[PDB]
Structure 1
């Protein structure tokens, strides 16, 4: 139910580069991993790439191996998708979605001779959980 904004699409020539931007609000962007789904008009969905909450684990597709880049910036709450070596088959709609696991904190910073103060998170477990429940409007990318 949170808002999803997608932008950065356009019409580009083959072999060019483009950047797609997805924005997050009303929820913690750091707490959810990102995925990119491609869908040509009139055909089924196609998974493209996935990144965890921290960004350590990056996963890509056999059709886009070595040519798609996906990154996340939690400070600005933004998702960057970098395109390399475009082809005419890439004309499709790209959908922005999030995760569901709601990663928690395994450890918090402490102060022994207190132990009662609220201190920021130290270590955390999460990521993966490649299930998408909220889908944004998406962006249209045309290659010609």
Structure 2
């Protein structure tokens, strides 16, 4: 509504490759308090991947990508990036970026229901 999110970067790679995704936020970006990445594989629910707090840049990584993925953001450019290293076939999914403006305690950032705006997604395939 107030914020539009456009993901980019998805493509087909092979197991072991690296791939970087990005999302550009626009509209009423002054209010952003956190952004996150989720992913939806075939037949699975949307799964939490990573979140970043907007002012300080504190990061939260999901257990299944912890140690291989890195989330970062640029406040001046209103972007958030997901660096994915050592990819695996199980990482194949549509990757969605989300944004929140309400304040929060950290525990809620893992939940798909905690975000106010969502992008259309970008397809990642790992052979």
Q: Normalised by the size of structure 2, how large is the TM-score? A: 0.86
Structure 2: stretches of 5+ with no match in the other structure: none
Compared with structure 1, are the counterparts of its residues 12 and 143 closer, same or farther at alpha carbon in structure 2 (3 Å cutoff)? same
Note the aligned Cα RMSD (angstroms).
1.8
Give deviations 1:22-55, integer Å, cap 9, x for gaps. Answer: 0011121673211111110221111011110124
Q: Going by fraction, where is helix more abundant, 1 or 2?
A: 2
Stretches (4+) displaced over 3 A: 126-129
- Gap runs ≥5 in structure 1: 104-125
**The structure with more radius of gyration:** 1
Aligned pairs for 1:127-142 (under 5 A) are: 128=106, 130=109, 131-142=114-125
- Counterpart in the other structure of 1:18: 19
Report what 2:43 is aligned to.
42
**Equivalent residue for 1:64?**
65
- The structure that is strand-richer by fraction is 2
